[PDB]
CSV table of C-alpha atoms in Angstrom, one decimal:
chain,number,residue,atom,x,y,z
K,1,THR,CA,-28.5,-48.0,187.2
K,2,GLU,CA,-31.6,-48.6,185.0
K,3,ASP,CA,-31.2,-52.4,185.0
K,4,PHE,CA,-30.7,-52.5,188.7
K,5,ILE,CA,-33.9,-50.3,189.2
K,6,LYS,CA,-35.8,-52.7,186.9
K,7,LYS,CA,-34.7,-55.8,188.9
K,8,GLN,CA,-35.7,-53.9,192.0
K,9,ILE,CA,-39.1,-53.3,190.6
K,10,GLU,CA,-39.5,-57.0,189.7
K,11,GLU,CA,-38.5,-57.9,193.2
K,12,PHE,CA,-41.0,-55.4,194.6
K,13,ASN,CA,-43.8,-56.9,192.5
K,14,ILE,CA,-43.0,-60.4,193.6
K,15,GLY,CA,-42.7,-59.3,197.2
K,16,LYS,CA,-46.0,-57.4,197.0
K,17,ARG,CA,-47.7,-60.5,195.8
K,18,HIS,CA,-46.0,-62.5,198.7
K,19,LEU,CA,-47.1,-60.0,201.2
K,20,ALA,CA,-50.7,-60.0,200.0
K,21,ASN,CA,-50.8,-63.7,200.2
K,22,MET,CA,-49.2,-63.5,203.7
K,23,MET,CA,-51.9,-61.1,204.9
K,24,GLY,CA,-54.7,-63.1,203.0
K,25,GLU,CA,-55.7,-60.0,201.0
K,26,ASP,CA,-56.3,-59.9,197.3
K,27,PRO,CA,-52.9,-59.5,195.5
K,28,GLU,CA,-54.7,-57.5,192.7
K,29,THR,CA,-56.3,-54.8,194.9
K,30,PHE,CA,-53.3,-54.5,197.2
K,31,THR,CA,-52.4,-50.9,197.5
K,32,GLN,CA,-49.5,-49.0,199.0
K,33,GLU,CA,-51.4,-48.2,202.0
K,34,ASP,CA,-52.2,-51.8,202.5
K,35,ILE,CA,-48.5,-52.7,202.1
K,36,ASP,CA,-47.6,-50.1,204.7
K,37,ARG,CA,-50.1,-51.4,207.2
K,38,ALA,CA,-49.1,-55.0,206.7
K,39,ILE,CA,-45.3,-54.1,207.1
K,40,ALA,CA,-46.1,-52.0,210.2
K,41,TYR,CA,-47.9,-55.1,211.6
K,42,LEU,CA,-45.4,-57.7,210.7
K,43,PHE,CA,-42.2,-55.6,211.7
K,44,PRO,CA,-43.4,-53.5,214.6
K,45,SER,CA,-40.8,-50.7,215.1
K,46,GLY,CA,-41.1,-48.0,217.9
K,47,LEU,CA,-38.4,-45.9,216.5
K,48,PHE,CA,-39.5,-42.3,216.6
K,49,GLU,CA,-37.9,-41.4,213.3
K,50,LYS,CA,-40.3,-42.7,210.7
K,51,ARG,CA,-37.6,-43.0,208.1
K,52,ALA,CA,-35.7,-45.4,210.3
K,53,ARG,CA,-38.6,-47.7,210.5
K,54,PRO,CA,-39.0,-50.7,208.1
K,55,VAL,CA,-40.1,-49.7,204.6
K,56,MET,CA,-41.2,-51.7,201.6
K,57,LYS,CA,-41.9,-49.1,199.0
K,58,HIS,CA,-41.6,-48.9,195.2
K,59,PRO,CA,-38.1,-48.6,194.0
K,60,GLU,CA,-39.1,-45.3,192.4
K,61,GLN,CA,-39.9,-43.9,195.9
K,62,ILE,CA,-37.0,-45.6,197.5
K,63,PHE,CA,-34.0,-44.7,195.4
K,64,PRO,CA,-33.0,-41.2,194.6
K,65,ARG,CA,-33.5,-39.9,191.1
K,66,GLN,CA,-30.3,-40.7,189.3
K,67,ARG,CA,-29.3,-38.5,186.5
K,68,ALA,CA,-28.8,-40.5,183.2
K,69,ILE,CA,-25.5,-40.5,181.4
K,70,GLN,CA,-25.4,-37.2,179.4
K,71,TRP,CA,-23.6,-38.5,176.2
K,72,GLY,CA,-23.8,-41.3,173.8
K,73,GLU,CA,-21.4,-43.9,172.5
K,74,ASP,CA,-19.6,-41.4,170.2
K,75,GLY,CA,-18.9,-39.2,173.3
K,76,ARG,CA,-20.9,-36.2,172.0
K,77,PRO,CA,-23.2,-34.9,174.9
K,78,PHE,CA,-26.9,-34.6,174.2
K,79,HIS,CA,-27.7,-31.2,175.3
K,80,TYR,CA,-26.0,-28.2,173.6
K,81,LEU,CA,-25.6,-26.5,177.0
K,82,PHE,CA,-23.9,-29.6,178.5
K,83,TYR,CA,-20.6,-27.9,179.2
K,84,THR,CA,-22.1,-25.4,181.4
K,85,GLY,CA,-22.3,-28.0,183.9
K,86,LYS,CA,-25.8,-27.0,184.8
K,87,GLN,CA,-27.4,-27.7,181.5
K,88,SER,CA,-30.9,-28.2,182.9
K,89,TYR,CA,-30.9,-24.9,184.9
K,90,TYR,CA,-29.5,-22.9,182.1
K,91,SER,CA,-31.9,-24.5,179.5
K,92,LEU,CA,-34.7,-23.4,181.8
K,93,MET,CA,-33.2,-19.9,182.0
K,94,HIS,CA,-32.7,-19.7,178.3
K,95,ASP,CA,-36.3,-20.7,177.6
K,96,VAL,CA,-37.6,-18.1,180.1
K,97,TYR,CA,-35.5,-15.4,178.5
K,98,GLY,CA,-36.9,-16.5,174.9
K,99,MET,CA,-40.4,-16.1,176.4
K,100,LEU,CA,-39.5,-12.7,177.8
K,101,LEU,CA,-38.1,-11.6,174.5
K,102,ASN,CA,-41.3,-12.7,172.7
K,103,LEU,CA,-43.4,-10.9,175.3
K,104,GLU,CA,-41.4,-7.7,174.9
K,105,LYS,CA,-41.7,-7.9,171.1
K,106,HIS,CA,-45.4,-8.6,171.0
K,107,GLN,CA,-46.4,-6.2,173.7
K,108,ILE,CA,-52.9,-15.5,197.8
K,109,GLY,CA,-53.3,-18.7,196.0
K,110,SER,CA,-49.9,-20.0,195.2
K,111,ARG,CA,-46.2,-19.4,195.9
L,1,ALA,CA,-4.2,47.4,211.7
L,2,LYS,CA,-3.4,49.9,209.0
L,3,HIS,CA,-6.4,48.9,206.9
L,4,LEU,CA,-9.9,50.0,207.0
L,5,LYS,CA,-12.2,48.0,209.4
L,6,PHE,CA,-15.4,46.2,208.7
L,7,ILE,CA,-14.5,45.4,205.1
L,8,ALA,CA,-12.5,42.2,205.5
L,9,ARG,CA,-14.2,39.1,206.6
L,10,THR,CA,-17.6,41.0,207.3
L,11,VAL,CA,-20.9,39.6,206.3
L,12,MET,CA,-24.3,41.3,206.5
L,13,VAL,CA,-27.1,39.3,208.2
L,14,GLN,CA,-30.3,39.0,206.1
L,15,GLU,CA,-33.6,39.5,207.9
L,16,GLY,CA,-31.9,38.7,211.1
L,17,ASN,CA,-30.8,35.1,210.7
L,18,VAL,CA,-27.5,35.4,212.3
L,19,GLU,CA,-27.2,31.6,212.1
L,20,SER,CA,-27.2,32.0,208.3
L,21,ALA,CA,-24.8,34.8,208.5
L,22,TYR,CA,-22.4,32.8,210.6
L,23,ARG,CA,-22.7,29.9,208.2
L,24,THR,CA,-21.8,32.0,205.3
L,25,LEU,CA,-18.9,33.5,207.1
L,26,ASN,CA,-17.7,30.1,208.2
L,27,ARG,CA,-17.9,28.8,204.6
L,28,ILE,CA,-15.8,31.9,203.5
L,29,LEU,CA,-13.1,31.4,206.0
L,30,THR,CA,-13.0,27.7,205.3
L,31,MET,CA,-12.8,28.1,201.5
L,32,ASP,CA,-10.1,30.8,201.9
L,33,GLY,CA,-8.2,28.4,204.3
L,34,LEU,CA,-8.1,30.7,207.3
L,35,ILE,CA,-9.8,28.1,209.7
L,36,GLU,CA,-7.2,25.5,208.9
L,37,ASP,CA,-4.4,28.0,208.9
L,38,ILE,CA,-5.4,29.2,212.5
L,39,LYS,CA,-5.7,25.6,213.7
L,40,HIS,CA,-2.3,24.7,212.3
L,41,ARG,CA,-0.7,27.9,213.6
L,42,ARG,CA,-1.9,27.3,217.2
L,43,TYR,CA,1.4,25.1,217.6
L,44,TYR,CA,4.5,25.5,215.5
L,45,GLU,CA,4.7,22.9,212.8
L,46,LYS,CA,8.3,22.2,212.1
L,47,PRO,CA,9.2,22.5,208.5
L,48,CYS,CA,9.8,18.9,208.0
L,49,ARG,CA,6.4,18.0,209.4
L,50,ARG,CA,4.8,20.8,207.3
L,51,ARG,CA,6.4,19.4,204.2
L,52,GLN,CA,5.2,15.8,204.9
L,53,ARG,CA,1.7,17.0,205.7
L,54,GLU,CA,1.6,19.1,202.4
L,55,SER,CA,2.9,16.1,200.4
L,56,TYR,CA,0.4,13.8,202.0
L,57,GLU,CA,-2.5,16.3,201.4
L,58,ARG,CA,-1.4,16.7,197.7
L,59,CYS,CA,-1.5,12.9,197.3
L,60,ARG,CA,-4.7,12.6,198.9
L,61,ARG,CA,-6.2,15.3,196.7
L,62,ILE,CA,-4.8,13.5,193.6
L,63,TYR,CA,-6.2,10.3,194.7
L,64,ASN,CA,-9.6,11.7,195.6
L,65,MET,CA,-10.0,13.6,192.4
L,66,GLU,CA,-9.1,10.6,190.3
L,67,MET,CA,-11.6,8.4,192.3
L,68,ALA,CA,-14.3,11.0,192.0
L,69,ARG,CA,-13.5,11.2,188.2
L,70,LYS,CA,-13.9,7.4,188.0
L,71,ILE,CA,-17.1,7.3,190.0
L,72,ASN,CA,-18.7,10.1,187.9
L,73,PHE,CA,-17.5,8.3,184.8
L,74,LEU,CA,-19.0,5.0,185.8
L,75,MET,CA,-22.1,6.4,187.5
L,76,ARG,CA,-24.0,6.1,184.1
L,77,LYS,CA,-23.5,2.3,184.3
L,78,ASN,CA,-25.6,2.1,187.4
L,79,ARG,CA,-28.7,1.5,185.1
L,80,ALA,CA,-30.9,-1.5,185.3
L,81,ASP,CA,-29.5,-4.7,184.1
L,82,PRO,CA,-30.6,-4.8,180.4
L,83,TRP,CA,-29.8,-8.4,179.7
L,84,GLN,CA,-31.3,-9.8,182.9
L,85,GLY,CA,-31.5,-13.6,182.9
L,86,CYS,CA,-29.1,-14.1,180.1
């Protein structure tokens, strides 16, 4: 939940300052690359799978994107396409279709 | 036997394409039912088997004609999806 992620971010900031102190580097200019190097030094793991190795990352990178509750206190959902069960996908499709209608009315670099 | 010869089931070859002449003659015999009649008359088809085959062929023709009618009726609706996306 949001409060949980906020607490995790506070924990991460405090721990980042602690790790900077441990390694003697400046807490202010301590980057994620520095954190990864420090953790790799302090907790050496030879596990082949990089994901199985110790990680001290931002909670944003760690935790998966959790979809927020889709209705308010009154119970009414927020998006008018909520009951489709795929509100975001169908909203995107609806917007694309509207753009196509407007276009029809008026008139090796990427993948 | 008692009729004149070379009038019935006779086709004239055009420019010497006997293959085309034979194809035309075969189409004529098939459409008139002579080929199927000869194939069926090779052995005696007992009356009950004949009746069953005739009924089966009639049902098959009814079904095929109705399915063809449905296909031709719906063929127009093979157009490009007009409301693509929505």
